[PDB]
Amino acid sequence: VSRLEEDVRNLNAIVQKLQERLDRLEETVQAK
Amino acid sequence: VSRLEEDVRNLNAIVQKLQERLDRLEETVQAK
Amino acid sequence: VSRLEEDVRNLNAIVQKLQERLDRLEETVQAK
Ligand SMILES: [Zn+2]
Ligand SMILES: [Zn+2]
Ligand SMILES: [Zn+2]
Ligand SMILES: [Zn+2]
C-alpha cells in the first residue's frame, strides 16, 4: 500500500465523518 | 481508470458538494 | 509530485478547511 493509497483511504474515512457531522448540524439547525 | 484515479475524482466531487452544503447552512444560520 | 499526488494534497487542504468551518458553525449554533 503506497503512501498515496494510504492517504486516499484516510481521506475517505475523514470525508465520511464530515458528512455525518454536517448532516447532524443541518438537522440541529432545522431543530424539529 | 484505476481505482486510485476513481477514488480521487470521487472525493473531489464529494468535497465540492460538502462545501456547497456548508455555504448554504452558514447562510441559513446567519439569517435565522 | 505527480498530478494525482497534488490532487490528494489539495484534498487534504480542503478537508482541513471544511473541518474548521464545521467547528465554527457548530459553535455558532450552540451560542445563538
Ligand atoms: Zn447520520
Ligand atoms: Zn440525516
Ligand atoms: Zn437524523
Ligand atoms: Zn465514480
Swiss-Prot record, chains A, B, C:
Superkingdom field: Eukaryota
Full protein: residues contained: 430 to 461 of 461
Family stated for the protein in its record: Belongs to the WD repeat coronin family.
Coiled-coil region(s): 1-32
Subunit structure: Binds actin.
Subcellular location: Cytoplasm, Cytoskeleton; Cytoplasm, Cell cortex; Cytoplasmic vesicle, Phagosome membrane
Tissue specificity: Expressed in spleen, lymph nodes, thymus, brain and at very lower levels in lung. Also expressed in cells of the lymphoid/myeloid lineage. Not expressed in Kuffper cells.
PTM (free text): Polyubiquitinated by RNF128 with 'Lys-48'-linked chains, leading to proteasomal degradation.
Function according to Swiss-Prot or TrEMBL: May be a crucial component of the cytoskeleton of highly motile cells, functioning both in the invagination of large pieces of plasma membrane, as well as in forming protrusions of the plasma membrane involved in cell locomotion. In mycobacteria-infected cells, its retention on the phagosomal membrane prevents fusion between phagosomes and lysosomes.
Record protein name field: Coronin-1A
Signal peptide residues on this chain, from the entry's feature table: none
